[PDB]
Design an enzyme around this catalytic site. Structure first.
Site, PDB file in Angstrom:
ATOM      1  N   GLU A 150      41.379  43.829  73.688  1.00 34.98           N
ATOM      2  CA  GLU A 150      42.099  42.283  73.597  1.00 34.98           C
ATOM      3  C   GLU A 150      42.124  41.605  72.343  1.00 34.98           C
ATOM      4  O   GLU A 150      41.997  40.524  72.762  1.00 34.98           O
ATOM      5  CB  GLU A 150      42.301  41.827  74.692  1.00 34.98           C
ATOM      6  CG  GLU A 150      42.763  42.639  76.114  1.00 34.98           C
ATOM      7  CD  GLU A 150      42.539  41.784  77.319  1.00 34.98           C
ATOM      8  OE1 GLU A 150      42.107  40.741  77.337  1.00 34.98           O
ATOM      9  OE2 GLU A 150      42.903  42.585  78.536  1.00 34.98           O
ATOM     10  N   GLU A 256      45.848  51.139  81.741  1.00 37.39           N
ATOM     11  CA  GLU A 256      45.750  50.203  82.909  1.00 37.39           C
ATOM     12  C   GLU A 256      47.016  49.926  83.619  1.00 37.39           C
ATOM     13  O   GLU A 256      47.578  48.785  83.924  1.00 37.39           O
ATOM     14  CB  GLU A 256      44.984  48.559  82.524  1.00 37.39           C
ATOM     15  CG  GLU A 256      43.849  48.769  81.562  1.00 37.39           C
ATOM     16  CD  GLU A 256      43.206  47.557  81.253  1.00 37.39           C
ATOM     17  OE1 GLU A 256      43.595  46.648  81.871  1.00 37.39           O
ATOM     18  OE2 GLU A 256      42.359  47.598  80.519  1.00 37.39           O
TER      19      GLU A 256
END
Ligand SMILES: [Ca+2]
EC number: 3.2.1.8
Length: 353
Positions: A150, A256
């Site tokens: 991220e 995910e």
């Protein structure tokens, strides 16, 4: 007849055996009972939802907590499962000790340029040793490393986390270099992010990885978290995102995966499972049908597809639903429901192409 339980139906991993591995995020207490049964039957890849985050492994300097992580590693090993590592470097919940200088003060507050340079070298040193210790312990079993997570900002450019404020882009370069050094040439190194389907964020991730690859930084693939919804993102933007990273010679992994029943933010969430209208579960099934059809179409470029959980009784979307519905609300993102019974979505991804 009610929908059968997950342990009573054909295996997902077997169905995708010739396409890509099928993974699940787990906690160590899920390695028993029905959840262990489901994992053995349906999945051939694992990731730790929380046990190998920086905060879990090294909450303070030199104080290592391996036991939960080691369980997951052993389970993968003894069931011939692949194993992703989540995650080596991440702005979320990083142990505060990383960003404290030698006197106990916060590096982000330092204003003297020479001292800021010293703090940068100290932080990179601590990051390198975190990576070296963890990679040396687990490289024998890890098959994909989320090296950084991220690092792209939703507003454009790079995320201005403490990592970026203190080191610029150097934490990213040094992270991959160190994971390659101790992982060996055979370690597969990934950069992981969410909303990789949004063209502007896709393009910023692409241009970061393209620049880093030109400088010799060893990046093997891109992780697409794929926290998605019923209506968003489009199949077309997902396709365009995978294609763009493949064109740089990178692997793609869906890391995910979960599909909210709601939009963003998840306003209007249902308060109990039995209140979810059948039409909405079927809309989810139709969305999953299209998504896994795209995955199979692009299977040569995807090595692994991992869901961020097993069944709807344990997942992070519940907390997000309560946040935006005054502390009440559930979500149901997987193909196995809160009772481990198959959902419409399971039937739409098990059937043949
Ligand atoms: Ca299908």
């Amino acid at each position: 007849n009610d929908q059968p339980f997950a342990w009573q139906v054909a295996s997902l991993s077997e169905r995708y055996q010739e396409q890509f591995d099928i993974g699940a995020a787990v906690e160590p207490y899920q390695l028993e009972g029905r959840q262990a049964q489901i994992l053995k039957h349906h999945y051939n890849s694992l990731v730790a939802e929380n046990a190998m985050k920086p905060e879990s492994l090294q909450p303070r300097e030199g104080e290592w907590n391996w036991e939960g992580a080691d369980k997951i590693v052993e389970f993968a090993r003894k069931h011939n499962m692949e194993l992703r590592f989540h995650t080596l470097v991440w702005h979320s919940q990083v142990p505060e000790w990383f960003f404290i200088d030698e006197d106990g003060n916060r590096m982000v507050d330092e204003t003297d340029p020479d001292k800021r340079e010293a703090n940068k070298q100290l932080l990179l040193e601590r990051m390198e040793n975190h990576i070296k210790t963890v990679v040396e312990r687990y490289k024998d079993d890890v098959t994909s490393w989320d090296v950084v997570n991220e690092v792209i900002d939703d507003g454009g450019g790079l995320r201005e986390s403490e990592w970026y404020q203190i080191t610029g882009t150097d934490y990213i370069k040094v992270a991959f270099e160190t994971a390659r050094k101790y992982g060996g040439e055979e370690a597969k190194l990934y950069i992981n992010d969410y909303n990789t389907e949004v063209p502007s964020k896709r393009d910023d991730l692409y241009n970061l990885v393209k620049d880093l690859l030109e400088q010799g930084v060893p990046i093997d693939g891109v992780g697409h978290q794929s926290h998605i919804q019923i209506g968003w993102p489009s199949i077309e933007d997902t396709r365009a995102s995978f294609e763009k990273f493949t064109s740089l010679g990178l692997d793609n992994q869906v890391t995910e995966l979960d599909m909210s029943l709601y939009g963003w933010p998840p306003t209007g969430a249902y308060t109990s499972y039995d209140d979810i209208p059948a039409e909405l579960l079927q809309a989810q099934a139709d969305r999953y049908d299209q998504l896994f059809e795209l995955y199979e179409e692009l299977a040569a470029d995807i090595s692994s597809v991992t869901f961020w959980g097993i069944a709807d009784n344990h997942q992070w979307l519940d907390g997000r639903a309560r946040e935006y519905n005054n502390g009440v609300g559930i979500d149901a993102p997987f193909v196995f429901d809160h009772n481990y019974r198959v959902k419409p979505a399971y039937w739409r991804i098990i059937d043949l192409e």
